[PDB]
Symmetry: C3
Subunit: 318 residues, 3 copies
């Protein structure tokens, strides 16, 4: 109930770095006129009579975290001085910054899930959680349920692939918008989190050979006279590479038929007379030959195998 018989004077004074110029930092009281001197005198403006001390130049933890001042009191006769230390406290006045605002990269569509796609780095000059950077994916373009599941970002700024890519069935391109925030702190005596400007990552997906070729038509038939000579054109078939970022050349072969030898095919899909034809032998089978054509890409697929497709063609003898 009875008050302490002493007070306590620290050798230091602690100011927050967001203390505005012209605010009162503190009052000097005795225990006459007061002053502040020495190389850091210009941080303060002292009222010599009242002891009122205002901040006269901005504080900044990032450059001058602490400094000394000399305080003086005078009774007219003698000036007594003491040194005082100023601790400047950090506040969340810096943002996370990246060195560029746009990035680009290419990735293979077979990139495995859990692979790092690209890494960004933002730095924030504050200390503590005010300096501790987190990353966020804000938007993915094109925006589909699937594009928003495709990529994810880690605390270190690495973007990881989270689902499988497809140049031909999903998208050849993505643009990700990101930001970086700090993990919060204080500014003007209340919570404050700072965020970066938006940044963009352009991703090109590279088409790899893993889709088989497809014939242009579900049906092909044609007719040929029974006396047609060796090498007569009958018809052209076409199959094309489903990997549209590749469009590998296709070749063809006759893999099977009713009447082996009667027809063959060139690399360019043209089916020709390759033997003596005979309308009379086909009177049982509707005067018709059925022929299986196989289309094969020139290069092997990603698994080191042939990329092929096949189908049957009907040909009318006369």
């Amino acid at each position: 109930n009875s008050p302490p018989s002493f007070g306590v004077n620290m050798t230091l004074v602690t100011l927050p770095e967001d203390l505005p110029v012209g605010a009162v930092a503190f009052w000097l009281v005795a225990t006459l006129t007061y002053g502040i001197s020495g190389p850091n005198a210009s941080y303060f403006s002292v009222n010599a009579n009242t002891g009122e001390v205002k901040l006269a130049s901005p504080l900044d933890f990032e450059t001058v975290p602490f400094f000394k001042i000399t305080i003086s009191t005078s009774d007219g006769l003698n000036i007594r001085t003491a040194e005082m230390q100023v601790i400047v406290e950090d506040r969340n006045d810096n943002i996370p910054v990246f060195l560029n605002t746009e990035f680009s990269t290419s990735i293979n569509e077979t990139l495995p899930v859990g692979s790092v796609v690209f890494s960004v780095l933002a730095e924030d000059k504050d200390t503590g959680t005010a300096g501790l950077v987190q990353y966020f994916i804000e938007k993915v373009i094109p925006s589909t349920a699937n594009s928003n599941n495709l990529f994810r970002i880690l605390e270190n700024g690495s973007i990881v692939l989270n689902d499988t890519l497809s140049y031909n069935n999903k998208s050849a391109f993505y643009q990700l918008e990101l930001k970086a925030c700090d993990s919060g702190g204080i500014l003007d005596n209340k919570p404050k989190t700072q965020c970066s400007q938006p940044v963009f990552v352009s991703i090109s997906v590279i088409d790899e050979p893993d889709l088989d070729p497809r014939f242009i038509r579900e049906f092909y038939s044609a007719s040929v006279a029974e006396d047609a000579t060796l090498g007569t054109s009958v018809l052209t078939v076409e199959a094309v590479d489903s990997d549209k970022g590749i469009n590998d050349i296709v070749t063809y072969s006759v893999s099977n038929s009713t009447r082996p030898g009667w027809f063959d095919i060139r690399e360019d899909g043209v089916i020709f007379v390759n033997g003596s034809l005979d309308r009379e032998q086909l009177l049982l089978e509707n005067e018709e030959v059925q022929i299986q054509v196989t289309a094969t890409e020139k290069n092997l697929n990603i698994y080191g195998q042939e990329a092929k497709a096949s189908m049957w063609v009907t040909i009318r003898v006369t």
Copy 2:
């Protein structure tokens, strides 16, 4: 050695938010009777004679981070007042909270490793590391060396798949227990970390068609008389889909034999007489026919191919 000739009076007072009601917050001293007035007067109780100031209502950084008070001194004749600011300091008095305590989801058993399975979010109202949420997987049920390797959790609350699933060979279901803690702070002047209540994630694994069918028996044989007519039942074989979450229908065909044509098989696994049989032709081969039966699932597997199995069957002619 000689003491400073001044003291220093700040314009503010800093209290921790866990200061208990009724504790002494501070003493007012001159430089008579003291008072506290203005809209925030009820935070304090002042002893007018001694200057003792107790906290009279709870402090709470989360709602009132700072506020002003008016302090007054009186000598009987005149009342002098000054404003004083109260900075309330954050302490770790909040826990990480999730919006529900149980979650459920389904995933395909072919989900690739490094995929996100499910994401939870906990929030903690404190600021700084006291507010910074970390996640933990506490338990996995069923508990095996393998179930505890299967899933892992990231700092953002995403549960990532770390090993491969199997509906049929591992488990159709998992239940994960999690918690969220903050990254520590101070409460009553010592370190304090806060944790959430337990939360649970129920995972259903979806069976996908990637296991071939299996015959019920390692051996099948039967007997048939040599004069048995076209279509006589001989025996039933059975193969079933190993994907037990699917149980796809199976069909059968005779893929090979000694004596092509003598036997065939129906979709329901029944092997029948499909030709004239002749005991005398088999006197060299133990009066026996061997037959290869192939079972094929009706739907294609995940890789777009036939799910098949085969075996040989012995049949005794008379």
Copy 3:
């Protein structure tokens, strides 16, 4: 402009834990001689006349975060005492520590991307960001563009596989050097981040059977006289397992030829006369037999299939 008519005396004093022994902690002033007493008296050394109080024993937040002292003033006649609390503030004076400096583990080369390879844990005794551990991969040996893309580390200390392994085509071994730092704090009034001693993780990659066997030579031919008897050696071919961590045994079979039956091959690669040979029948085909040899590993590959390779061999009859 006119100074406040009171000062404010807190019941506590706050010191940073890096306050050096022998520095002035504070001055006691009245409101005669001063003293400090009670069980924690030895933390301070008081000048009884001047009120100068120096720190007399090291402060340490990690063991004694706060403690009480009794301060006394005497006028000769009576001694008045009050208790004062000392709050010790945490500073970043501890480093992240791991329990060992070297670790080792083995992983299968088919380990999927996004799998955890190994986990380390460092702990740092400080509180707040000064206690919050981050991990870094400093070096990978051997150092190639590819080895530095292979592994990545998460905030929880798990090393994740980021690209595909190969015992035979990349490396059977890696050594990773890591460190752990805290997330910064203050020491002697300025920012300070602490780092661990280096730690090493030795990774053995286990060779799995997923590469086919390869013949030693691109060409083999030999000669045999036309009257050579049943079982005469002609030549030895050799194929070996490309999985050099395995070196599975290989067997051979003749998969095809011009003149079926004339030659066969043993498990040890030796090709022998297996029929009556006849130089005269081969006068059209350059007195030569061409033979396809297939080499097959004894064990199935990781996908449950045969690991095979084939080639043609020419054999001169006389």
